[PDB]
Amino acid sequence: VALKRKYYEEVRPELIRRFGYQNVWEVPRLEKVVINQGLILEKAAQELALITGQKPAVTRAPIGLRVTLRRDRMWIFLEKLLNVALPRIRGLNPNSFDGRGNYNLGLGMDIAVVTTAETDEEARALLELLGFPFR
Amino acid sequence: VALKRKYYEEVRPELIRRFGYQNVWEVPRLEKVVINILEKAAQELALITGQKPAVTRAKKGMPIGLRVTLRRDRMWIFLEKLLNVALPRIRFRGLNPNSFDGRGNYNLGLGMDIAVVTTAETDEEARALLELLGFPFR
RNA sequence: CGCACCUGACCCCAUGCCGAACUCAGAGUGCG
RNA sequence: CGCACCUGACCCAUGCCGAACUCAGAGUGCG
């Protein structure tokens, strides 16, 4: 919720000033965060459900658990990742963009942050201004 | 399909030159065309689109219209017929250039109503895409 | 070997229209 | 009143996700 507010109040106007977008709907915005937890199953699923607030799908060849977060579950999870999880580790790789505006992070737990930016450069600016700790 | 070829060979490079897009996937591109007794209207609409129309029913269940959402090659084939055959044979002043919805999509009615949905984010870019594809604006 | 992106529809499966979605398939981008 | 866009979440929905399907709501476009 706080992270979402930051998007509207702080990030979106700064993106407009930096890239010259003429309308608000053109500005890059997070679309979804996809979490895949590679691989008892019962326990892994309940933990992933607890941390995302969403029921995981079982991916079968059972080799994985997947959630697609959008809207407020997306923002709430991100806020947890940036404020709680990451700072308990011993910053993000700025080259890990897929060439089409999406960021990939592996922790194995793979996370895809999918944005509506069409370029890595704009996606980078969006995620940096949201407080993703790069470099 | 000739209209599709025209998009890739002629329209997309001209949009790149005019608006300065740095990558091909950023260039505006058609996403879909939505076309909105019953037996007869459905058979004709199916024949001209190559697709099965959905029946819109009152939210009573009496039929109040027919809709088809065309994507991909059925979209291009239908458009080519619309631009080359149907529109110029209207007993015709050209399409209204003010009928963009403010978000890059165009609407016209002939009643047969047609929604042309593009990935352009502004009316100005959508206008350029549809003009270069051969939409005949007045 | 997996997920995301990307591109498709012979194939299991699918649209109360649409391979959009769901399903399946395929050799490059990112990550593990 | 409908379709497209847009914004959401009592019928309904996701083999996860209001993405989709469903439903709802002033605005924009078009009937």
Numbering used by the authors:
A (entry chain A): 5 to 43, 52 to 73, 87 to 115, 119 to 135, 154 to 181
B (entry chain B): 5 to 40, 52 to 74, 84 to 115, 117 to 135, 154 to 181
Give the article text.
After considering a number of possible candidates, we opted to study a complex of a 34 nt stem-loop derived from 5S rRNA with the L5 protein of Thermus thermophilus that was previously solved by Perederina et al.. The protein principally interacts with the terminal loop of the RNA, whereas the free end of the RNA is flush-ended (i.e., perfectly base-paired), and projects away from the protein. The asymmetric unit in both crystal structures contain two complete complexes of an RNA stem-loop bound to the L5 protein.
The protein-RNA complexes that ultimately yielded the best diffracting crystals had terminal 5′U-3′A and 5′C-3′G for Cy3 and Cy5, respectively. At the end with the protein arch we observe electron density for both Cy3 and Cy5, whereas at the end with the RNA-RNA interaction no fluorophore density was observed for Cy3, and weak density for Cy5. The electron density for Cy5 attached at the RNA terminus at the RNA-protein interface is well defined for the whole fluorophore, including the C5 polymethine section. The C5 polymethine section sits over the cytosine nucleobase (C26) and the proximal indole is directed out into the solvent. Yet some density is observed for Cy5 at the less-constrained RNA-RNA interface, so that fluorophore stacking is not solely a product of the constraint observed at the other interface.
